[PDB]
Amino acid sequence: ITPSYALGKVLQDAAKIQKQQKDSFIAQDHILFALFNDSSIQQIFKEAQVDIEAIKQQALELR
Amino acid sequence: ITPSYALGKVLQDAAKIQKQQKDSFIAQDHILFALFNDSSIQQIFKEAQVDIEAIKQQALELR
Amino acid sequence: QFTERALTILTLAQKLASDHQHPQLQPIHILAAFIETPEDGSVPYLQNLIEKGRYDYDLFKKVVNRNLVRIPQQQPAPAE
Known part of the structure; x- marks a missing residue:
């Protein structure tokens, strides 16, 4: 459907992240941040994405 | 004191701005965006800075 | 005192308390220090007493992780 x-x-x-980051095309990474922020795997057996500090450091270290 | x-x-x-920008360290501009969001100049003719998305556009001109 | 091999583990344990932003070092962080990385010579994890003792060290790591996620706080300023 949609x-x-x-x-x-x-x-x-x-x-918005792209503008924050000075990048002209949308990065899948920026999607990961925007995406992750909406989601939340709140299982007692949490798999919820590690929060932004670990996510961002690892993103910055990509390649 | 504090x-x-x-x-x-x-x-x-x-x-939080570091997370937005993929910056490994806090930048003076991150401090300014945060400062601008919370601080204002309380005068009879009170003023505040343009929102930080507009400000970030200016931040991106430097380096 | 401690030699370098023990200090590595002890250092890791304290680091882990900070990796989990916890105010204090707990036995769980040390167990986590025992299982850091898949480097065979690490008696605390792979060429270990555990395998020789007929136990699954990765399953144990799952136990450790299950316990680590139960740490009551990850607050930055309160850590260490």
């Missing part, structure tokens, strides 16, 4: 309002928000947020 | 809540929050928000 890309969903949920992702209209995530992808637009990814676009 | 930075208080006032600057505690600013510096903590500056860290």
Whole structure:
């Protein structure tokens, strides 16, 4: 059916990240941040993405 | 004595900016964005800075 | 005192308390120090007493992780 309002928000947020980062095209990485922020795997057996400090450091260290 | 809540929050928000920018360290501009979000000049003709997305556009001109 | 091999583990344990932003070092962080990285010579994890003792050291690592996620706080300023 649809890309969903949920992702209209995530992808637009990814676009905001691109502006923050001075990058002209949307990076999948920026999608990972916008995406992760919406999601939350709150299992007692948590798999919820490690928060932003670990996520960002590892992102900055990519390649 | 202390930075208080006032600057505690600013510096903590500056860290949030690192996550937004993929910056391994807090930058003076991150401090400014955070500072601009919380601080204003309380005068009879009170003023505040343009929102930080507009400000970030200016930040990106330097380096 | 401690030699370098023990100090490495002890250092890792304290580091792990900070990796989990916890105010104090707990036995769980030390157990986590025992299982850091897959480097065979590490008696605390791979060429260990555990395998010789007929136990699964990765399963044990899952136990350790299950315990690490139960640490009550990860607050930055309170850490260490």
